Design a protein around this ligand. Structure first.
Ligand SMILES: C[N+](C)(C)[C@@H](Cc1cnc[nH]1)C(=O)O
Ligand SMILES: [Fe+3]
Ligand code: NA
Length: 436
């Protein structure tokens, strides 16, 4: 199925038809969005904190997106000179488990990098289509990487104390609409599903997005909504976090070692109702928003709900999501993707985010966990610009996450972007139920 079609809508650049100005605007929108995100931090020294203890300090990510562009475009030949070789080494490699520069210095690197990148986009000969061997792939890779980091850095900043932050002007949250709408299982017809793209696809992809796997999917029942905060509140209030029947050993230990008694972005003080941390402020828990959980917590809720309902629940496979999410004639405006809002939306409230099987928010709103591990597909090959993008993580310890959140833009909002995280890592991410 070609990408960019009525049922494969993409938010990224059509690489067989994008003019220079389209590339420049796509680059600028990404860079300016990242600037805006980092400018939300109103105390300079917060850049030296690592608000997510599993990731580097904010200052690293401030330099990282800029250095990545320079490194890849130099390797592709689009740029000749380095700006700062020391920076281009120190800020090049991220972490998945020094002496930092001053914030002003890193902003200064960004400004110099931005100027050099823009000039290369303005002046370099452009021959369409942009394919993997075309030097321009480094520009597209650089933009798509920055777009991923806007989202991943947003999750870091969400973990910074709100007293050091101010929401950027123009960024708006979605409002709650009230109580969670009633959950319902709906039937998705099975079929033989293709996973993976063929190369020279007219759209960007990462190495792990390309390949061929065909899976026979049986008819299945899936919850039409992502599991909501209101649904999950029943799990919390009924002792789900204290009941070992709902947890396997690995998740129980995680839960105990991290003192977890509720989802990460819920908060409670005394007997007051739960609060909920948006990007930059706390509100009363929005019962109709999708709950944002680790994979462990999603599985624990599945076990709890199966006990209550007298059945078994599990998460979708990758093939199941493609079937559940299929929507002919889909449009970019249908989904809570690409900063349509700067928060999750009430489940179902994006009324055109209903798949052809009646499943809501399969694309957008919050990532959804899958029950399957990151694996390469038949035909997997690395790209010469970035050997270690996915291969280090084929350890059967990373789970797939799919469909994008409100914060996913560009190729990260694609149906065909194959995303992954450790089961204890937090993202703007939820889940739905499958009858097992
Ligand atoms: C594919 N994810 C989103 C899991 C990756 C993408 C990525 C960014 N910089 C290097 N790789 C990650 O954030 O580690
Ligand atoms: Fe990175
Ligand atoms: Na989703």
């Amino acid at each position: 199925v070609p990408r960019g079609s009525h049922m494969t809508m993409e938010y990224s650049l059509p690489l067989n038809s994008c003019d220079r100005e389209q590339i420049l605007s796509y680059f600028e929108e990404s860079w300016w969005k990242e600037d805006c995100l980092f400018n939300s931090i109103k105390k300079e020294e917060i850049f030296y904190t690592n608000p997510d203890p599993l990731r580097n300090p904010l200052i690293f990510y401030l330099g990282h997106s800029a250095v990545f562009y320079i490194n890849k475009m130099r390797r592709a030949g689009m740029i000749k000179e380095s700006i700062n070789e020391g920076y281009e080494e120190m800020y090049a490699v991220g972490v998945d488990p020094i002496k930092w520069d001053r914030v002003e210095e890193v902003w200064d690197y960004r400004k110099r990098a931005y100027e050099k990148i823009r000039e290369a986009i303005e002046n370099t000969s452009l021959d369409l289509p942009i394919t993997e061997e075309n030097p321009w792939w480094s520009v597209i890779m650089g933009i798509e990487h920055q777009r991923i980091h806007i989202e991943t850095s947003s999750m870091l900043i969400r973990q910074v104390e709100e007293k050091w932050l101010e929401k950027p002007s123009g960024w708006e949250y979605a409002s709650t609409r009230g109580v969670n709408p009633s959950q319902e299982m709906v039937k998705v017809e099975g079929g033989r599903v293709r996973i993976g793209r063929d190369r020279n696809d007219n759209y960007y992809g990462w190495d792990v997005d390309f390949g061929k796997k065909e899976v026979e999917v049986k008819d299945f029942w899936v919850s039409k909504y992502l599991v909501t905060n209101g649904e999950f509140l029943r799990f919390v209030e009924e002792g789900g976090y204290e009941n070992p029947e709902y947890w396997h050993e690995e998740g129980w230990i995680w839960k105990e070692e991290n003192g977890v008694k509720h989802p990460k972005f819920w908060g409670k003080r005394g007997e007051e109702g739960y609060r909920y941390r948006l990007m930059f402020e706390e509100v009363e828990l929005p019962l109709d928003f999708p709950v944002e959980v680790s994979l462990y917590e999603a599985m624990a809720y599945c076990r709890y709900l199966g006990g209550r309902d007298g059945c078994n629940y599990r998460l979708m496979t990758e093939g199941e999501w493609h079937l559940a999410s299929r929507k002919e004639g889909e449009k970019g405006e249908d989904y809570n993707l690409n900063f349509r809002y700067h928060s999750p939306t009430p489940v179902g409230s994006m009324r055109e985010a209903r798949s052809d099987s009646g499943v809501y928010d399969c694309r957008g709103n919050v990532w959804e966990w899958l029950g399957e591990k990151l694996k390469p597909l038949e035909g997997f090959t690395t790209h010469y610009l970035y050997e270690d993008y996915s291969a280090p993580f084929f350890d059967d310890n990373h789970y797939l996450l799919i469909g994008g959140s409100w914060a996913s833009s560009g190729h990260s909002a694609s149906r065909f972007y194959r995303n992954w995280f450790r089961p204890y890592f937090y993202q703007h991410a939820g889940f739905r139920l499958v009858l097992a």
